[PDB]
Amino acid sequence: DSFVIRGDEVRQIAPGQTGKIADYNYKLPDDFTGCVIAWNSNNLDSKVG
């Protein structure tokens, strides 16, 4: 499950979390089995303009 979010919003992608994108964009179950991969993509998903 792949998506792009901010650098401070990475803590919300976890079971039992509360947040903005945790409610309105992407929700995980409380008994969630599996796990998340996160990395910095500042060189590919950013433009000066």
Binding site: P15, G16, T18, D30
Partner: protein
């Protein structure tokens, strides 16, 4: 005190029931001893604990 044995049986049964009732008022390390309070105060991840 002639009928002490029957009264003792009755007292022990009533006292055991009263102790069982009183044990509902203990929180056993939880935030509250009332289930309704916990359910109306917390989300399922922490209310579950």
């Amino acid at each position: 005190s002639a009928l002490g044995k029957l009264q003792d049986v009755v007292n022990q049964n009533a006292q055991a029931l009263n102790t069982l009732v009183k044990q509902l008022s203990s929180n056993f390390g939880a935030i509250s001893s009332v289930l309704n309070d916990i359910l109306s105060r917390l989300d399922p991840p922490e209310a579950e604990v």
